[PDB]
A paper describes a structure:
TA modules are small operons encoding two proteins: a ‘toxin’ that interferes with basic cellular metabolism, usually translation or transcription, and an ‘antitoxin’ that neutralizes the toxin and protects the cell from its potentially destructive activity (for reviews see 1–4). The toxin MazF is activated under a number of stressful conditions via proteolytic degradation of its neutralizing antitoxin MazE by the ClpPA or Lon proteases, (18,30,35) and was proposed to be under control of quorum sensing. In this paper, we present a method to obtain large quantities of active SaMazF and provide the structure of this protein as determined by nuclear magnetic resonance (NMR) and X-ray crystallography. The SaMazF dimer is formed by pairing strand S6 from two monomers to form a dimer-wide 10-strand anti-parallel β-sheet.
Three different crystal forms of SaMazF are available, which lead to the structures of 14 crystallographically independent SaMazF monomers forming 7 independent dimers. In particular, among the two loops that show higher RMSD values in the X-ray ensemble, loop S3-S4 (Gly48-Lys54) is involved in lattice contacts in all structures. It is unlikely, however, that crystal lattice interactions have a major influence on the conformation of this rather extended loop given that all conformations observed seem to belong to a single family, with only two individual conformations (form I chain D and form II chain A) deviating somewhat from the canonical conformation. Loop S4-S5 (Ile61-Lys70) is involved in lattice contacts in most but not all SaMazF monomers. Four classes of conformations are observed. The most common conformation is observed in ten chains, two cases of which do not involve lattice contacts. In the remaining four chains, this conformation is prohibited as it would lead to steric clashes with a neighboring monomer. Of these remaining chains, form II chains A and B adopt the same conformation while form III chains D and E each adopt a unique conformation. Loops S4-S5 of the latter four chains are all involved in lattice contacts. Thus, it seems like loop S4-S5 will adopt a default conformation when the crystal environment allows for it, but will adapt its conformation otherwise.
Numbering used by the authors:
A (entry chain B): 1 to 113
B (entry chain A): 0 to 113
The structure:
């Protein structure tokens, strides 16, 4: 039942250097065929806002959700493939409008167009 | 940093869990070049030797044999991650513009873009 745009709690550790660690919310960015059948998902890390700045690859989460600060930011430059066993609990999902901004930052992040 | 989108680097992807791609293996840099110049991190796709050649929309075959790269190699656009640059070991090679177009296409399939 995992779908693109869902938000899950995931354990991202261990990490190294500037990679995003901890157990934190992540947004599922993989296509839904993959989410249905594959052992793995691709996700983008979400973090609380530290020093609000205008960064092309970041997307602000606006509405406060379950286990999600209102100040939260999706980091489209912190991306990874996780075994699904890493997903802990479904927190929420993002609106179609928000997922458009996510797609746009993802395309910036990955040098697509 | 001289690191550029389309470069292939040897990188240590371990530790990993479950079906995540582990080991020290070649990876292709897929992040935009502003990030590759200035950022502490890069985004990459894992490359592996071909096990049971199959027609998988998110895989891209490397055709020409390169340094420390088998000719049978496949780029896995469903195994993607952000690595601290300290993880990159040595530059193996770079991919042609034509090959990077196939990579972009599989990447868009993989991530549900269009």
């Amino acid at each position: 039942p995992i779908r693109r745009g869902d938000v899950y709690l995931a354990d991202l550790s261990p990490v190294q250097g500037s990679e995003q660690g901890g157990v934190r919310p992540v947004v599922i960015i993989q296509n839904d065929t993959g989410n249905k059948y594959s052992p793995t998902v691709i996700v983008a890390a979400i973090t609380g806002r530290i020093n609000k700045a205008k960064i092309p690859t970041h997307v602000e989460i606006e509405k406060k959700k379950y286990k999600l600060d209102k100040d939260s930011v999706i980091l489209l430059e912190q991306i990874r493939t996780l075994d699904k066993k890493r997903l802990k609990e479904k927190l929420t999902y993002l609106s179609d409008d928000k997922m458009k901004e996510v797609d746009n930052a993802l395309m910036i992040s990955l040098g697509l167009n």
